[PDB]
Structure formats: C-alpha cells, structure tokens
Design a protein around this ligand. Structure first.
Ligand SMILES: Nc1ncnc2c1ncn2[C@@H]1O[C@H](COP(=O)(O)OP(=O)(O)OP(=O)(O)O)[C@@H](O)[C@H]1O
Ligand SMILES: Nc1ncnc2c1ncn2[C@@H]1O[C@H](COP(=O)(O)OP(=O)(O)OP(=O)(O)O)[C@@H](O)[C@H]1O
Ligand SMILES: Nc1ncnc2c1ncn2[C@@H]1O[C@H](COP(=O)(O)OP(=O)(O)OP(=O)(O)O)[C@@H](O)[C@H]1O
Ligand SMILES: Nc1ncnc2c1ncn2[C@@H]1O[C@H](COP(=O)(O)OP(=O)(O)OP(=O)(O)O)[C@@H](O)[C@H]1O
Ligand SMILES: Nc1ncnc2c1ncn2[C@@H]1O[C@H](COP(=O)(O)OP(=O)(O)OP(=O)(O)O)[C@@H](O)[C@H]1O
Ligand SMILES: Nc1ncnc2c1ncn2[C@@H]1O[C@H](COP(=O)(O)OP(=O)(O)OP(=O)(O)O)[C@@H](O)[C@H]1O
Ligand SMILES: O=P(O)(O)OC[C@H]1O[C@H](O)[C@H](O)[C@@H]1O
Ligand SMILES: O=P(O)(O)OC[C@H]1O[C@H](O)[C@H](O)[C@@H]1O
Ligand SMILES: [Mg+2]
Ligand SMILES: [Mg+2]
Ligand SMILES: [Mg+2]
Ligand SMILES: [Mg+2]
Ligand SMILES: [Mg+2]
Ligand SMILES: [Mg+2]
Ligand SMILES: [Mg+2]
Ligand SMILES: [Mg+2]
Ligand SMILES: [Mg+2]
Ligand SMILES: [Mg+2]
Lengths: 304, 304, 304, 304, 304, 304
C-alpha cells in the first residue's frame, strides 16, 4: 500500500504542506457542493489497497466540512482502500465531550461514532480539547501535542522567558500551564472567572504572582477570545509588564479579532491547525506556529 | 409513553402543523449555532420514556440540518427516550443511492448509517427518490406517498384532466407516471434527454402523443427545474395545449425560479415537504399541496 | 495471497470457465446434501491467507444454493482466508428490494445481511435488479453490466439494427431501454400493462412507433416470460416486422419455455448468469451470451 | 402486547396444537414459493407491538424452511413487532456444532448468526443436539427437555421398566442415558461402534449387562437409524429380551423406515418435534409423544 | 417492571442502605467463588421483565468484583430482565482514561466495553475520575456528584469555613476546587508537585494564600494519600492553621492509613462509595459522608 | 509482520518454552498490580503491524489473569498490532458453557464476548471443556488436543497398556475414553456417580470389566480430584490391580493434593497447561506432559 493524501475543503494549504513534506502530490479529489447544498465528493483516482489519509480540520463551515470528511471516508472504504485515516487537526465538537446538563448531547461521541461508521480505521489529531476523546473511538487515535513547538516559540521569541510566569486563563487549563511551566522551570499562575450567579459584573480572581513579570497566557483554544482577553485585563491590572497569549487552536470566531485588536497582547500565537490567513490580515498581533511537520511525522509513523 | 414532537431548524412550520393536527405543543428545543458554527442543541424538557418524533427535512442548509437532526436524535437517546423517530419529509442525499461511478460514495447509505448510529429507531419519510433506501436501514422506514394528494389536486384543478396525458420528464419517472395515468385512466407520455456524447445541442425525444391535449409533467422532484423546463419546451413544441408540472419535492435551487418564471407552465405544483414560502414570493406559478396530514397520520399510526 | 476460485452447485460450468480464463483450477470443494437435506460443505484445501472467490448464482434450488454459499463463505472465513468474495452472477431475492406492501419483507436486504454475517468481504454480481442493492451492504459491491455484450450481439446478429426500435416490456425497464437506444442511436418504445383493477382482459398500451420496424425487447430478466410474451403480441399487433427479446437473466421458470415456443420471437437472447443448457434443449429460440470474461475481469481487478 | 403465533410450512399441525392450547388462532400467513423457487412470505395481519412467536422446525426441506423462518422473522421485525421469538422444535444444523475437521464450517453457529441478524429476540427449542448451542446466540435460548415425557412413556408402556436397562447407542449419549437411568433407578449400558480404521466389518462393543432384560435405547435423534439399528442387533446378540428405541427427534431420513421395519424393535418412540404422520404410515413400530404442551408452556412463560 | 436491587460482594452495606431507602429487600443472589477461584453467581429469583439494578463498587478485589458485576449483568440479561443497570459508585480503572504513553491501554474504555457487551443498559456512578468516561459508553451514564454533600459537611463541621481556603492537591483538581470555592464564596489555592526530572527531593509549589487560615484539601480520591499528605505538609509549611482533607473516594490502599495517622489532618472526610469500616478502625481521623440517598434517588429517577 | 510472544502473569514458564521453541525472546511486558489491585499492563515495545500472541492460561488468580489478558489484548489492538491472538492453554470459565439452571450465566460465552470486544482476532487453546466453545466466538478458535501426547505417555510408561482398560470417571468423559480406547485397541469402562437425591452415601456404579487389569482414568480435568478419587476407590473395589489418572488440565484446587496423596493412584498425569511446579512439590504422584510443542506448532501454523 502507498500513502494517498486527500484534502477536504477546510484546510487545503495544510494538506499541501503535509504532501510536500511527504514528497507526494495531493490525491485528486473534487470537493464541491451540489446546487441544493449537498456535499459532492468526486475522488479522481483509484485508492484500491492504498493507505488513505484524509486531511480535514474542524473549522470554517463545520458541518459542511465534517460531512465532506465522512463522505470521503466512506467513498474510500467502498473503493476498497486498505486503510482510511482521518487527519483532523482540530477535532470538531470536541468541547461537547460530556453530559453535564439535562438532555445535553455528547456531540464529540456522536462525531466519533459517525467517523467510525463511515469507516475510519485511524484518527490523527492535535491537542484534543479532552484527551479522553481518544476513548470515544474503538480505533487507534493519535492525539499529537503542539507543546514542544510552543516551548520552542517561547524560548526563541520572549527574551525574559526565564523570569516569565505561565498563566492559565481558566481552571481547566491548569494541567497544560503547569506542564509548560515545569518544562520552562518558571512560575505559573491561574486566573478564574467565578460563576455567574446573577447579572452583576464578571469578576476574575488571580492566584499566583505576576507583578512586574512577563505573563504568558497558554490555553488550548481561543474561540471568541473572551477568556484570554479577560485574563489579559486581569493580568495587567495585577501588574504584569507584558502579556502574551499562546493557543494551539485559533478559532477566532465572532468578535475575537476586534477583541484582540483592542487588547494589550504583545502577540497572540496560534498553530495552523485552523487556517489563519484571513485572521492575520485583520489582526497584526496574530503569529502562527507551523505544525505540518508534526502531522506529517504522525502520518509517516502510522504508515510505517 | 407520550408523543413528543421536536422541530429542527429546517421546516418549523410543518412541525407546527403536525403538532396542531396531533393536538400537541412542539417540544421545547433550542436549535442554534455556536460562534464557531457548530450545531448547538438544547432540549428543554425531559424525554425519559417518551415516544420522540423529530421533524427535520433535508432542505436549506442540508449538512447543518442533518447534523442538527443527528445531534437531537443522539441527545434524545442518551436522555433515555423510549423510542426516537426521525420524521424526514425529504430525505437528504437520496439521489446518491448507488455507485455507478468509480470511487463514488453512496451518500444515502452513509446518511442512513449515521442516523442508525445516532440512535434512530424509526424513520418516517415521504416519496424517497429510491424506495430501496428503505433497505439502507435495519429499522422500519415508512416511505409515505403524496400520489393520492397529487390525484386530488389534478381532479380538482384541471378541468380537462380526463383527456390529459401524464408526462414523465425522464426515463426514471416512468413508473410514477404510469401509476398516475392508470389511476386517472388517461394516456401517458415519456420524454428523454439523450446522453451528452459531445458538446452539441441537448435534444429531447418524446414518446407518446400530447398534441392538442393538456400535458401534466409528474416527477419526484424539481431541483434546478432543468428537467421540467426542457420537458415543457418539448411538450409545447409537440403541440400540447397547456403544460402543468407536479412534483412532490420542490427544491427550486439555483436558477429554478427564473427558469419557471420564463417557462410556459400553467402551474408548478409541489408539496410542502420543503418550505416554499420564499419560492412562492418570487414565482406566482408555484402552488403547494399540504402533506402534513399524511405525516401526522404516519406518526400517529407508528405510535399506535 | 493467491486467487482461490470455489464453485457452488448452482453454476459449475461458469465457475470452470472463470477458472480457465484465470489460468487456475477450481478449488477442491465437496458440496453435497446430508441425508436430512442439510447442506454439506467440505472444503478440500487450505485457504489460509488466500483471496477466496466463491461463485454461486441465484438460480435452480435457490435456498439450497444460497445456504451453500453462506456455509462456504463462513467456512472460508473461519479457515482464516485473507478475503472472501461472493461472486453471485444473479443475485437471489433481488426483486424483493423494497417494502411496498404491508408486512412485506425486504428479502434482498435480508440476503445481504446474511452474506455480511457469513463473513463476505466483497460481492461481485451482474445487473442487479435494483442497483440500490449495492447499498444493502456495507462492503464493496461490484454491479457489472452485460449491456456492452448485449450491444455487441445486436450489432453482429441483427442486420437492420440501425433502423430498429428498442422496446421496454414494462415501465421499470425504461432506463435500460433508453440507454441501449442512445448507445445504438435508434428509436425506443415502451409497453405498459395497466394495473389489474378487476378480472377483465389484461390490455397493453404501447407508446412509441414500431410499425414496419424490427423491435428488440430488452429487459433485465425473463422469469415466466409473461412480460416479454405479452409485449411481443402487442408489438406484432402494432405492426412490428420481427421481434427479438434480449435479457441478461434467463430464469425461464414455470411455463416460460412453452410460452416462448408459442411466441413470435426471432430469438430470445440471455446471458449465462443462469445455466441455460436445459432451457436451450427445449427451446431453439434461446441463444446465450457468454459473460464469463466480465466476471473473470471483475475478479482479477478486485484481486489486483 | 399480545401473543401472535405464526406457522411456517414445516410443522403446521404442531403450530395448530400450540395455538389451540394457547386458546388462539394461528396468525394469518401465506408461506409459498415464487415460480423461481424463492421463498414468498405474506404476513396477513398487523404485528405492530405484538409478541410474535414463529413456529418452524428444522425438518423436511431444511433450507427452504430455515429461509422461510428467517424471512418471517425479518418481516415481523420490520413490521414493528414488539418481540420476535423463533420456536424451533428441532434446531437445524445442530450436529454441525464444532470444527473438528480442517476447513469444516460450524453451521449451527452460522444458523444462530442468521437468526440473530434476521432479528430474533428469543429462541425456544427442544433438546438441542449440543446444549452449548445456547451459547451460539447473544439472546436468551430456551432449551426444553422431553426427558420427563420420555420417563412418563416408559413408566406407562413398559411393564418391566423397573428391571430394564437404558442403553446408549453411542458414547455421546452417555449423559442422557445415565440421567434417565438415575431417574428410573435402573441399570444402564453403553454401546460403542469403534472407529473405521479400514474397510473391515463394523463391530460394536457393549459395556454393561443387558442379558435377559428389556433394553431401552435412548438417544437424541434417529436420522438414518444406523446407530439404533446396529445397537439393537448388538443388544439382541448380547441376550436382551426386548429392545425399545426412544428418541426425541425422529428424522427417519433415507433408509431409516426400511431399517426399522427389518429391525427387532418392540417400539420406536419419538416426539413430534418433527412431523411423523408420513413415517407412521410406513412403519407400525413408530409411536409419537406429544410435546406441544411443553412448547406451549415455554411460549406462555416467555410471554409472562 | 419492578425495581430489583442486587448486591455484589464489594459493598453490601451500601446496597442494603439503598434497598432500605427504596423500601425493598435485596434480591436473592449468591456471589461466591468456585474452588479454582472462578466467580460463581447464583441469582436466586426471577428477574423476567424486571428493572434490575446491580450495585457493585470498584474497590477491594477489583478484578474479582468487576467480573462478578459482569457475570451478574449477563445472567440478568439472559434471564430476560427488562433493563439492567450497573450501579457502580466508584468506577474501576477510571484513572486509565487516556493513552498518554506508548502502548498504554485505555482500561476505562475496556471496562466500559465489557459492561456494554455484558448487556448493561444504564450506568449509575458517582464522581467519575474523568466525566468523559460517560462518553466511553453508548448507553446513558449517570455521573452523580457528592459536591452538595461535601458543602453540607463543610458548613456544618468547620466553624471558620467562611474564611477558609479550598486547596487543590494537584493541577487536575483545579476545576473541582474552584467550583467548591465559588459555592462557598471563599478563596482557593492550588498545590503542584513538579515533575520528577531526576532523583532529587520532591518539591511542592503553592499558588495562593493559605497563611493563618483553615485549609480544606478537596480532591476526587485518596488512593495512597501521597498527594494529600504532601499537600498537607506544604500547607502547614505555608502557615495554614488547620488542614482538612475531603475526598469522595477513599481508597486508602497501601501506606495510606499510616500516612494519615502521621499527618496533620484535622479530619479526612470521604464518602461511602467505598467501604470505610476497616479504614476507620485504624485511623480515627477518617469521617464518612453517606451518599446512599444520592444513589437511591438516582435509581428511583432512572426507573421513573 | 513478525511473531511477538507476550506472557501474562499466569504461566510464564510455558511462555518461555514457547518462545524458545520459536527461537524468539518474550516480548517486553510489565504485568503488575497498582496499589488498589487494579491490573497494570505496560507493553515495553512496539507491536505496530506485528503478529502478537499473548499467552495466558486460565489458572491461579483467574479473574486477575483474565483481566490481564483482556487489557493486554486491547493495548496491542490500540497499539496497531496487525493481529492479536490469545493463546489460552486452559480456557477460563469453560465449565460454565450452558444454562441448565434458572438464572444461570453462560460465563464461557461472556468470556468469549469479552475477548472479542478486547480485540482478539484468533484464539488458540487446548482441550476445551466443551468443543462447542469454539462456536462462542466469531473468530477462528484452535482447539488443540493433548490426546496424542497422552497415548505416547501410556505406551511409554505403562508396561501392560495393551491389556489395560481406559475408565471414564463420569458420563461426560465417555467420548474421550472411547476415543483413547479405540486408539489403543483396549477395553473401556465408565464410572457414574448417581445423582444426589438426598443426604445418603454417594454411591458409584461401574459399567465394564476392570477386574485384575490396570485401569487408566482419563478425564479432561481434575479440579478437586473428587471425581478421580471416588472413581479410583470404585476401581480398586472392583478388582483393578493398578489405577492411573491422566488429565490434561491439572487444576488441583482445594483438597486435591491431600486427596491424591491419600488415594491409590500409581501416577497422576497432567499436562502443563496449568503450572504444576507447586503441586509436584507436595504430591510425588503427579507427573507432567509437556504440551509446549503443540502450542508452539499451533502458533507457527497460525502465523504461516
Ligand atoms: N463550539 C462551542 N463554542 C462555545 N461553547 C461550546 C461549544 N461547544 C460546546 N460548548 C459549550 O461549552 C461548555 C464547555 O466549556 P469548557 O470546555 O470551557 O469547560 P468544561 O468542560 O466545563 O471544563 P474544563 O474544560 O475547564 O475542564 C459546555 O456547556 C458546552 O455545551
Ligand atoms: N443533490 C444533487 N443534485 C444534483 N445531482 C445530484 C445530487 N445528488 C446526487 N446527484 C447526482 O445525480 C445523479 C443521479 O441522477 P438521477 O437520479 O436523475 O438518475 P439515475 O439515478 O441515474 O437514474 P433514475 O433515477 O432515472 O433511475 C448521480 O450522478 C448523482 O451523483
Ligand atoms: N422471484 C419472484 N418472482 C415473482 N415475483 C416476485 C419475485 N420476487 C419478488 N416478487 C414480487 O414481484 C414484485 C416486484 O415486481 P417488479 O420488480 O416487476 O416491479 P416493481 O419493483 O414494483 O417496479 P419496477 O421494477 O418497474 O421499478 C413484488 O410484489 C415482489 O414481491
Ligand atoms: N445432518 C447431518 N447428518 C449426518 N451427519 C451430519 C449431519 N450434520 C452434521 N453431520 C456430521 O456428523 C458428525 C457429527 O457426529 P455426532 O454428533 O454423532 O458425533 P460428535 O459430535 O463427534 O460426538 P458426540 O455427539 O458423541 O459428542 C460431523 O462429522 C458432522 O459434520
Ligand atoms: N489505580 C491506579 N493507581 C495508581 N495510578 C494509576 C492507577 N490507574 C492508573 N494509574 C496511572 O496514573 C496516571 C494518571 O494520573 P492522574 O489521573 O493523577 O493524572 P492525569 O490523568 O495525567 O492528569 P489530571 O487528572 O490532573 O488531569 C497514569 O499514568 C495511569 O496509568
Ligand atoms: N470452576 C468450577 N468449579 C466447579 N464447578 C463449576 C465450575 N464452573 C462451573 N461449575 C459448575 O459445574 C457444573 C458443570 O459440571 P460438569 O461439566 O461436570 O457436567 P455437565 O456439564 O452437566 O455434563 P458433562 O460435562 O458430563 O456433559 C455446573 O453446575 C457449573 O455451574
Ligand atoms: O471562551 P473562548 O475564549 O471563546 O474559548 C477558549 C477557551 O474556552 C474553553 O474553555 C477552551 O478550552 C479554552 O480554554
Ligand atoms: O414477469 P416475468 O417475465 O416473469 O419477469 C421478468 C420481468 O419482470 C420483472 O419486472 C423483471 O424486472 C423483468 O422486467
Ligand atoms: Mg471542556
Ligand atoms: Mg479551558
Ligand atoms: Mg436516481
Ligand atoms: Mg427522475
Ligand atoms: Mg421490469
Ligand atoms: Mg455431536
Ligand atoms: Mg449421539
Ligand atoms: Mg487529581
Ligand atoms: Mg460440562
Ligand atoms: Mg467430566
């Protein structure tokens, strides 16, 4: 079997980078929409007995892209592919990973079941919102981490990183922040927005010392940037000299770009698990880390 | 168990009509989008041990609506509903019901598998593009027909229906047209667009006599209305006095409205398996048949 | 893995032809009946890690043959075959492909499920009665077409084929007839037997012109030959000079042979998806098209 | 839910007896053959939300009957039956319960899988050839025993039963014979036909004393009656006064009737798990035990 | 259906309390070991059509108890129980919820799959180590919380609770501690043991102010009590006046009792999700919160 | 793919012997217990695309070992092993192979389902208590026999084996004893312990002649040795000169060692499907047959 790399419509630049790093051309696929907005998938070459990798991030038109991915997986399976791997750099519906409300769906589990029934044999993803999503499948799931790239960026771009403090923007990010602070041998702090019991002002509590130090906000994602922006205001109010934000998934939906442009961030650093070209054109603060080498190595090791 | 009727975002007017005919209020559901365009489903009441019917047509934002339906089905199943029935008046991806091309997906089968893995126990649908889609599930699938309503409309709205000829716009509609012509005891004709071997003019062959008679075009759906419009031009060129078009699914995507407005149709008749309010505002020729009684009776009989 | 071709009891001559075209000997199998008429299957060689193809048509003792096929598939799977492919030239129960009656089984779906649970990984078949039967499986299903062989026979055996008209014996055959007429660039006609509302005479309506032309009846199968015989009487009554019947599946059950012998057919042409040796001995009008090359190529391409 | 009893073509007299003992009429089913010998099943009434019991023994046209049963189960499941129970008095392919030969199928497991995929929720059977066949399903399997009826017959029909010896015709029947001898507080003996190493005379070894005593041969089934006839010759040669044979499944295939008529049996006693009307007309030695009360009680207790 | 409560060998006192609160007697079960240490389960009453709840905590002989639970679930399913619910107050293998090491099993997912294949229809558990374990099943999973009982204990047993600080013993407990601190409107602190890069002294970093205040350590479990004991030493070294430890799962395996007896805890508070009778006899500091009302209410609401 | 042999904690000496006979080193695995007695499995090498064989007998800590085996199978499957084979020399729970009691579990079927859901693709076992356990899986199951080794031992260690009688200790062993007696061309006898109707003395009935001959007791297993010890007393009381006991599975649980030491056995012969080192130290009568060559050949042939 040979590696066949197919791109969905979501992140074709990343698919191209992966294919170039693998020394391959992207597989011939036409991924369009029928007139009635149904997903049209036209695989343009044989995948018989091939090791098929389909790259599709959960971003942009989320349901469009997920349906595209499922249809492409099923087409490859029925086309007698030896193995079909879904390379999903940002797993869609990953934040819906539990039922902590009445009648709430576990949408991540539903997405996993849909991928399984489409015929996926392997999942490669980066920085799952919850690592337990690996357990939502009965197939191997590669949960790659961008933390080494994030440490590289910190050591190369922040001069006073040895005296910095890594800040969690919420309680759920504590493990990630403590891991990064341990690897950098630096202090850490945590910021918590307390629960909205009524309609008073949202107030943020900070535990840890950030006074007269560079604060690096590290989180798994920035969707609306409310978390990181509120944390940044709190950090400046607490005496931080400079504030950085490093995420692995830059979703930047809704008011995020205006929020960041009006915030105090020295830089907002994200990986390219989600396309950032449009976001960078409206926010100069955004910088991107390439994770295509991580995904390419994951695909190569999965194949080998 | 009690009937619980939940509406997706696709066709809420039809859901309301079904609920009124059942003497029920629609179940409390919030069906919105998160900021990153992920489907958000918030069932607002208990469905424990209930007989849940979710109404969601394959129309509008097709993948959005299908994901909404799957998430709602899964939420109801995990919320311990006694039975979850997907009422899908127009089955999405129904035209992708076979693999007659290399690497082509059977998207209808994938949709059926996704509905099954979401936890649907029963499917109620109207006029499947292929009745064999019933066999794509391992659960009961109700394939309701709007043909009786179509005969009622013909007998009540076309004065010379006893001398009319029912015309198939393509070869695949022959069974439907012959059935309708048998029930009306009228002649039938078939129109075929021959295969596009090169880039010459599309030419249509008509078998049957339509000269100086009213021609009724009957088909399962009109997506772009290319089929019915070309058939209408052929029928007028063949000497038909008046031309009607009766469909059960009025998709009317793309250039369909302009095509119909510039066509010679006496009336374009569709059911309300797909919302038609917007279409009727731009095309006076469109008239709608209510099939809410058929769906309500199907739901009631399924429950009983 | 190596190709292993095993024959059931149904069509062993076709299995032999396939094996010869593949340059192989048929695998050693004893397919008999126990005294109590239970199917006895004794595979006489190892199939460990082999690519096993089991040839069994749905014909003759239908349930006997299908049980034989299922038992052989399961034996090969438990015997650790690398892949088991069911080569079913005529798919049994294919006409029971939908539920259009109360309490009606979808027997084709049941047969597909039985083949899947027996352990089939691949299905190779010719001219499924409904192509959607491909969607009854979750494994790849090859639906081969004998249409090219049927065009070859027409061009080589009917002198006036360029002025002929291809006739559908019922409404359901319209797509097949239109495709053949397009490929031959000839006229087509359709014959419909209207529905039996009471016990009066069956009457047939013909749409299209067949007067003073050779009429070629093309259908997917001739079971009792009532359809083709009634169509032939109608065609002669309509002024056809000569009438041919071309089928891909010659079932010829019940009164078919006497019907054909008393009909006006110039020739009844079938493929050898079903054994025809016995039928040809009692009906000189029957001629056979060899499709063993199509099946052999399908098996070879599936393996490769 | 209400009890619905449906009969296959195999044993309709037993189905009638069960229905009468349950105070019910048999459900309306037409179980015939299409012209091409495909099984035709036409359930003539609603089974929606019903507790459906389908009675079909593995006997007569074995594959015909099993396909009939599977099609009826699937039709009932798709017809939204609350529960479908297969009442199979004699389980087909039960003797193919293991793989003790190269490439041998486990046909009993295949039959169990086919019943499961057809949609059976419950199996009721009598005296499985191997009780471990219960483990071939993931659904409850009732393995009823006719041993109490066999003890009743012995105590009522054999005057010297207290001095009799119960004889196993082979090594595999030892448990059944020891159980019966324990319940009767009588001696037991075992007869073994040693393995056929070459083409010499089959010789039988008897362990136990049967001299000048009535010998009762007890086995689970008599297919060709070679086992019981050879055992009877051995028992007479060993000095048994009278020889009885009691089976639960009287298959009596092939030469069994001539073998019994030429044997020395005082009586051959079988249950009516298989129809015996034809067998009794040609062999006066055959007597039948009614087990319809056992099956009716099993169905009633399953329902309750 | 009626509630049937069955106890495994793990926590029979809790099962008795649940049954008393439900006004029921425990179902008759003999749960012993065969001589070869295989689990022997003897359900002593009918569960046909019953709503069966099996109470078995993951504690004591973990694999013994889990096998007992699986065997009891399967026995109830094969005994035709209407519904089988596994009441597992402490989910076994819950800490093995992800693959963050090469070749590491996801044992929680394996346990979920084993429970599913045993036939469990519903899981009721308290304070899953990871809430995403709910997504390891395709059945409803009730993840009950003992947090309200923990707040009740704090408000009733700690006089200065309004000036206390709730302390996380590790980074992973941050969400639980922040939730509790929000509900009590008190400060929170976090303690992190930094990663063991080499064999030097384990050192703990504290973020937050605990000086001259009562510190309440809140965590999901205390297995060896290394986490809480090290956190307690750090808290006293940081100037905490008194230190409490509140857990929901008191495992207290290995050296935990000696560790607590030599620690500075004012009280170690656990729920009775695990039996604590033996632990309390050797450690006076341990106090227990009854959660039997939570489990009983969960069972009652699941049934209703 | 390469053979990877992994040992569980149950029988590591047998795993070592198998690996040496295969010319391999055992795969690196740490199989220990966490503090709370949960099974800890740490596979120390890659198994990607490997043919993994896990050796784990059902013996010792039965549930501990079975959980170890399941966790190792699942870890290998998630670690992308090409194929995972469970080499289970003594199948656990094999005696719970049917439901002959109310509410009784079929624990063998549950174990098979657990192995299947853990991801086993192949089972290799020796002398299943019931061969129908092969049918409890849908994967190939190798049921190897130690009978040839048992015949070798008899012919090499019993001087008067040609005049011996092979004795079944119960009715269920009759087939095994008759097979062995046929292969040795010797007489056979059967011993039955009649059913315990009340609390009187257990009495044993012997059928067959053992007077003044060597008696060889052959059974599938000796758990408590009650069966073989009672049979030995009966055989001596019946005039047997010497009594041997040959088993394939020496469980020797509970009072078995004291029973054998106080019995009259010339030798108790078992295979090493279960470790016997401890048993031989307390009972000089026990001798062991090596079956490692049988298991090694089975693994090699499965791989090839
Ligand atoms: N795309 C989305 N955008 C915004 N909110 C979402 C989205 N998907 C799910 N949610 C909602 O967000 C919430 C999950 O929030 P979040 O992941 O920040 O915290 P958590 O899971 O409660 O705790 P933590 O991650 O700190 O352990 C849920 O209520 C979920 O329904
Ligand atoms: N939403 C869609 N809009 C347009 N074309 C579609 C859509 N979905 C599928 N198709 C394509 O349309 C074709 C199916 O066309 P159609 O159903 O008219 O004819 P058919 O299935 O070949 O024959 P017939 O229905 O006459 O038996 C396929 O090539 C399929 O990929
Ligand atoms: N072997 C068989 N012989 C005869 N009739 C059969 C057989 N199997 C199924 N049938 C019945 O024949 C009918 C199917 O007929 P047929 O395939 O000619 O038409 P259709 O499916 O209604 O329409 P069309 O094929 O024209 O789209 C069903 O009522 C089915 O039960
Ligand atoms: N319907 C049948 N008629 C005759 N033989 C059959 C039938 N079905 C299976 N067999 C064969 O009969 C054999 C099974 O024989 P039988 O059940 O008498 O003995 P066994 O299973 O080896 O041992 P025992 O039942 O004494 O424990 C197998 O070789 C099987 O293939
Ligand atoms: N019963 C057990 N006892 C001890 N350690 C266990 C047990 N089960 C699993 N482990 C191991 O403990 C580790 C999990 O530790 P823990 O749950 O404290 O932290 P985490 O999952 O890495 O992060 P966190 O819970 O803070 O988000 C894994 O290495 C796992 O293999
Ligand atoms: N590990 C075990 N130790 C002891 N008894 C067990 C064990 N596992 C199951 N049993 C019980 O032993 C009985 C099975 O006994 P046994 O296998 O000797 O006879 P059988 O299956 O009734 O008949 P036979 O094997 O002679 O055909 C059942 O009641 C079963 O529950
Ligand atoms: O609130 P947003 O900034 O839109 O979302 C980003 C954060 O919110 C969620 O907890 C994520 O895990 C991130 O920590
Ligand atoms: O009616 P018969 O000639 O027996 O059967 C042959 C035809 O009937 C069915 O529609 C088939 O598809 C063929 O078109
Ligand atoms: Mg979250
Ligand atoms: Mg967060
Ligand atoms: Mg179509
Ligand atoms: Mg059409
Ligand atoms: Mg037809
Ligand atoms: Mg047998
Ligand atoms: Mg026998
Ligand atoms: Mg923790
Ligand atoms: Mg047994
Ligand atoms: Mg025994």
């Amino acid at each position: 079997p040979n590696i066949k790399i197919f791109s969905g419509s979501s992140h074709q630049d990343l698919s191209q980078k992966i294919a170039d790093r693998l020394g391959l051309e992207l597989g011939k696929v036409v991924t369009k929409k029928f007139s009635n907005q149904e997903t049209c998938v036209e695989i343009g070459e044989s995948v018989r007995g091939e090791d098929v990798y389909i790259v599709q991030s959960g971003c942009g038109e989320i349901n469009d892209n997920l349906m595209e991915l499922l249809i492409m997986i099923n087409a490859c399976k029925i086309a007698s592919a030896s193995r079909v791997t879904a390379v999903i750099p940002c797993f869609p519906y990953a934040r819906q990973d539990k039922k902590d409300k009445s009648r709430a769906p576990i949408s991540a589990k539903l997405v996993a079941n849909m991928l399984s029934v489409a015929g996926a044999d392997h999942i490669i993803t980066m920085d799952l919102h919850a690592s337990q999503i690996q357990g939502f499948f009965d197939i191997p799931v590669d949960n790659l981490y961008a933390e080494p790239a994030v440490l590289k960026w910190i050591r190369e771009n922040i001069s006073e990183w040895r005296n910095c403090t890594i800040v969690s923007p919420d309680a759920g990010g504590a493990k990630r922040v403590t891991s990064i602070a341990d690897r950098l041998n630096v202090d850490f702090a945590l910021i918590h927005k307390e629960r909205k019991k009524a309609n008073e002002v949202d107030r943020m509590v900070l535990v840890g010392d950030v006074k007269d130090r560079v604060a690096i906000l590290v989180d798994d994602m920035a969707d609306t940037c409310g978390t990181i922006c509120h944390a940044a205001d709190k950090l400046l109010s607490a005496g931080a000299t400079r504030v950085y934000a490093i995420l692995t998934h830059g979703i930047f939906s809704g008011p995020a770009i205006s929020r960041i442009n009006n915030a105090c961030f020295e830089a907002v650093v994200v990986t390219n698990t989600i396309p950032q070209e449009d976001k960078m054109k409206h926010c100069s603060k955004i910088q991107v880390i390439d994770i295509s080498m991580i995904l390419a190595e994951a695909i190569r090791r999965t194949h080998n």
